[PDB]
Amino acid sequence: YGAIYSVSGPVVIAENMIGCAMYELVKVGHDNLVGEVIRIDGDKATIQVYEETAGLTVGDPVLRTGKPLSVELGPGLMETIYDGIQRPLKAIKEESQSIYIPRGIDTPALDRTIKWQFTPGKFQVGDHISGGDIYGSVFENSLISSHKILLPPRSRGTITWIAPAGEYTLDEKILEVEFDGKKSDFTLYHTWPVRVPRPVTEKLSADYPLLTGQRVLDALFPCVQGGTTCIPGAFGCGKTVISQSLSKYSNSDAIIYVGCGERGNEMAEVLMEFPELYTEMSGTKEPIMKRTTLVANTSNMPVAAREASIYTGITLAEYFRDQGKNVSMIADSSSRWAEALREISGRLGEMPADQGFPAYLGAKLASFYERAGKAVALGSPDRTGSVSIVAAVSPAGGDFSDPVTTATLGITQVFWGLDKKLAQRKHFPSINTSVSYSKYTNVLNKFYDSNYPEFPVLRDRMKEILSNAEELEQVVQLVGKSALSDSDKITLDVATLIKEDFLQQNGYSTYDAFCPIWKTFDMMRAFISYHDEAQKAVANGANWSKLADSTGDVKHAVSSSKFFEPSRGEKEVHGEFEKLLSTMQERFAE
Template structure:
C-alpha cells in the first residue's frame, strides 16, 4: 500500500515501490483508477482516467498488478463502453445521468447466462493452443460468438463443459499447461490493450470493403484489412461519412470509437442504429455494432486509452474469423490527449507541441490493422479507418502528415465541396488509394471486366475539367472549344450524377457495386455519345440542352440497388436521346462546308 505525494491535473505522484510501468493503480478514497507511466526510485507517476479534483496528498494508493486490459467474451455486441471499457448503459443505471467518479461496474454482465455449444472435435486429451475455438455462443441472431482459448494458453484439455447455459464466470473447462499447472477456462478472457493480439500469419488483403458510397468504392477503394484515413476540417462531413460507412459496409462487425467527439453524435448513433437494418443480413445493425465512447468532455487520459480498447476488441473478433471494421473518430483527439500528458510530463515538444514519438505511436497503432490467418486456421481482418481533424483544415499539420505516410487509402474531405453541399465532400483530386490494382481484380471478376478502365476514364475527365475550370474562371466559358465545353459538362454530370450521394435519401444512401458500375457506365456512355457528335461538328451549347443530361442526374435516386435492370434499360436508351442531333449532323457533316460556302 502506498500514498499520494502530489496531484497535478490528471497526473499523480505516488509513493508506491515495486510497481511495473503500465500497471493499473487505484488511488484515494474515491478509488480512482489510472496507470503508471513513470518510476523514479520509490515513487511512481500515474495518469488517472478520472478527474482528480478532491484528491489530497497522503491518501492511499495501491498497485493492482495488471496492465489496462479488456474483457473479451459474450455480451460485447450492441454495448456502449467508455474509454476504459466501462459499460455506459449499466453505469447509467447505477450512477445516474452523470458519470460519478470511481464507479466500478464490470465490463461484461456477470449474471447473464449464455448458451454454450462446445466444439464437437474437442475432448479430454485434445491438445489446445492459444486461439483454438472451444465452442460457440449465438450472441445475436446474426453473430455467432466463437469462444477462444486465451492466446497464450497451450496444453492438454482436461475437460470441457457440455452444451448448456453458463455465465461468463462459470468454469467451462480446464487445461493442463506444459509446466503442469492447471488453468481454468471461461467464456471470456482478458487481454492487455496495448499489446497486439497474436495470430498465425499475415495474409494478403484481397476483397474490397464495400461501403455503398460511390466515391469511395469506385474511385478510392479500401480493402478488408486495409488502412484508411479521413482527414477533413470541421463541417466537411467527416462524421456523416463515417456513419454511412458504419451503417452500410459489408464487414461482419463494426466497432465505432468516438474518441473526444461530440456527445450528441454518439446519441445519434445509439438512437438510430437499432432502427436500421443491416443491408446484408436484414437484422438490426446494432447486433453487429459495438461502440466505445469517450466524448470530448470526458477525462483526457481515458481518451488516449479508448483507441487501444477499440482495436483490441476488433482484434478479438478478427481472431474468431470475422471481417471487422474499426472507425476511430478522431485520431487527432487521441494525439492531443498524448500531447496533453506529454506536456504535463515536461517532455520536449517537437511540432506544434506534440511529443517526438507521435509518428511511431500512430504507425504502431495502424499496424494493428490487417488480414490474418488466425490460430484456428480461419481468415479474419481488421480494417482501420481513422478520422483526422486537422486544425484549420491544414493537411500539413503533424497528425495528418504522419498519418498520410502510414495509410494506403486517403479520403480527403474538402471544405469547398462541403460549403457547396456536395456530399460526401471527398475531394477527387486530393484523395488516393494504393489498393486500386487489388480491387480491380475483384471488380472485374464480380462486377464488370471494364471497371478499371471506366474508373480511369472518369478520373481523367474530372482532372481535365479541373484544368478547364481554371480557364473558365479567367476568361469565361465562351473561350472554350465545343470539345472542351462538352468535357466540362460531362465532368459536371459525373460529379452530380455519380459522386454526389445523399445520405438522407432512402434510395441513394447505399449503392451496390452493380449499381455503382451501371451508373458510371451510363454517364460515360452519355459523354462518349456527345463527344461523337462534337467531333461531327455539333456545338456543345446544343448538346447541353438535351434533356437526358438533367434526367441522368436523377437516376441515382430513382433506382434502388435491386433495380439494376431498369437502370440498364435506361442506358440502352441513351443513344436514342442523341439520335435527332446525330441525324442532323451525320447527314450534314460532310457537305456542311459546301453549304456554308454557297450562300
C-alpha cells in the same frame, strides 16, 4: 502498496511504488481510481488517473493490480456502450441509478448476470489446444449467431477438462488447460492488454472491397476490407453519412464505433440513433446494436481515457477478427486522440516536436493503424478475419496541414480528403478529388476483373476527365472562357454533370442512401459513354451548342440515373441501364 506523494491534475506521483511496472493499472486513492503508471523514477511511479483526480490527498494508498490496461473480451460486449476504458455506461446507470458516473466505479466490463448458451467445439478432453483456438460457441444475438469462444493467446497446453453444453455465465469455468502441470481455468471471457496487439499467424493482403456506399468513395478511391481510410472528421458529410452507411451496408460482420473527444450531444446522437437503425442482411430486419460495440468517450472524460479509447476499440476489433469476422472499426476524431496524446505529453513534461504534438505521435498512430488488415486468425480451425480502420481527422486549419494529418497520410493506404470549396457549396459528400487517393486500386484490380471488368478503366477515365476539367476551369477563371474548343466545352460540361449527379449524392435520400457497386459501375458506364460519344460527335463535326440543345433529354436521363432506385434489384436496374445507354447511342445519330 505504495502511497500518493504528489497530485497535479491527472498525473499522480506515488511513492513506495517499488517493483511496479510501466503501463500497469494501479488503483489510486481510497476510491480505487484506475491509473496507468506512465513514468518510474526510483520508488516513485508517476501515474495518470483515468478518472476525476480532485480530492486525492497525500498518503492515499495505491494498489498495484499487476496487469496492463486490459479489455475484457468475450460474449456480452457485442451490443453494449463503453467509455474510454471498458466501462459499461448502461450497467453503470442501472447499478448507480443516477445520471452521473460515480468516481471509482467498479462495474464489471462484461456483465456476469446473463446466462449464455454454450456449445463445445471440436476439441475434447485430452487434445492439445494452443492460443487462439476455438473450443466453443455462444449464441449472442440473431446477427452474431456464434460468438466462438477463443482460448486466450499465449496460453497453451492440454485440455484437462471441458464443460458440456449448457447455459453458463462468464464467471463459471468453461475449460481447463494443464500446460506444465499447472492447471489453468479458462472462462467464457478473457482479458487482453490494449497496447499489445492480438497475435495472428499471418496477415493476408486485403482483397475484397469495403463498400462504403458513397459513390465517389466506392468508385474513385476504393477501400478494401482491412484498410485504413482517414475520412474527413466533421466538416464534410463524408464522415457523418459514411459511419451509418458502413454500419448498415458495409457487409462487416461487426462494427466497433470509437468516439474519442466526441462532442457531448454528438455522442448522445449516436447512442440514441444507432439502436433505431436496422439492416436487411438477414431474412428479417435486425437492429445494428446487435452488430456494433460503441466506445463512447466525450470530451468531458479524462484525457487518459480519451487516449485509451482508441486502443480499447481497436483491440475489440482485433478480438472479433481473431474470431474470424470481418470488422470495420470506425475511429471518430483521431485528431482528438492525437490532441489527448499531446496533452498527456505536456503533463509528463516531454519535449513536443511539431506544433506541441509529441515526437512519438507518428509511432503511436502507426502502431494503431497497423492493427488493421486481413489476417488468418491463430489456432484451429483456420479462419480469416479482417479489421478495417475508418478513422476521422478533424480539419484543424481547414486543410490537411496538421501534424496528425501528416502522420496519418504517411502511414495510411486510403485518404478521402476534405474539399472546403465543395463543402461550402453544400455538395455532399465533400471529398476533394485532387488530394484524395486510395492505394488499394492495384490490389482491388483483381476483384474488379473478377466481377466488374470495366470498373478500373472507367474510374481512371473519370479521374482523367476531372483533372483535365480542373485545369481547364483554372484557365477559365483566369481568362474568361470566351474561347474554348468543342472538346474542352464537352470536358467542362461532363465534369459538371459528374460533380452534380455522380459524385454528389444525398445520404439521407431514399434512392441514394447506399449506392451499390453494380449501380455505381452502371452510372460510370453511362457518364463515360456520354462523354466519349459527345467527343466522337464533336470530332465528326457537329456543333456542341446544337448537340446539347438536342441531347438535353439524354443528359437529363443520365442525371436521373442517380435517381434510379437501388432496391429494385441488380437484375432489373442493370436492364434499365442497358436500355438507358442503348437509346443514348441512337439519340446522338441526330
